[PDB]
Design a protein around this ligand. Structure first.
Ligand SMILES: [Zn+2]
Length: 107
């Protein structure tokens, strides 16, 4: 109901806390890569997730925030309410941004 025949997101991706629109439908690819994401918290413990929306560029995002670059890694957070991490990003791989399905909502 969420992944298309082409493997894209059939529905819009949004923040589960405030409803902020993170991604428009059909702009990301489903990915089963294992990534550890600290438990959801305010911007300033976790889970190894294996279901993500793979985004090619941060410009593709509708609304999204990034944490202070630490260890070549930046966590994605809701741009509006700032709760996260809803995603993950390794700076070495400029064109790979991941948004964990469990950490977001869909409409
Ligand atoms: Zn939010």
């Amino acid at each position: 109901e969420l992944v298309s025949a082409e493997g894209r997101n059939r529905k819009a991706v949004l923040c589960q806390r405030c409803g902020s629109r993170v991604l428009q439908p059909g702009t990301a690819l489903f990915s089963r890569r294992q990534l550890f994401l600290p438990s959801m918290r305010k911007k300033p413990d976790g889970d190894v997730l294996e279901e993500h929306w793979l985004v090619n560029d941060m410009f593709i995002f509708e609304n999204v925030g990034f944490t202070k670059d630490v260890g070549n890694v930046k966590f994605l957070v809701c741009a509006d309410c700032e709760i996260g991490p809803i995603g993950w990003h390794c700076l070495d791989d400029k064109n790979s941004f991941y948004v964990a399905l469990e950490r977001v909502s869909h409409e």
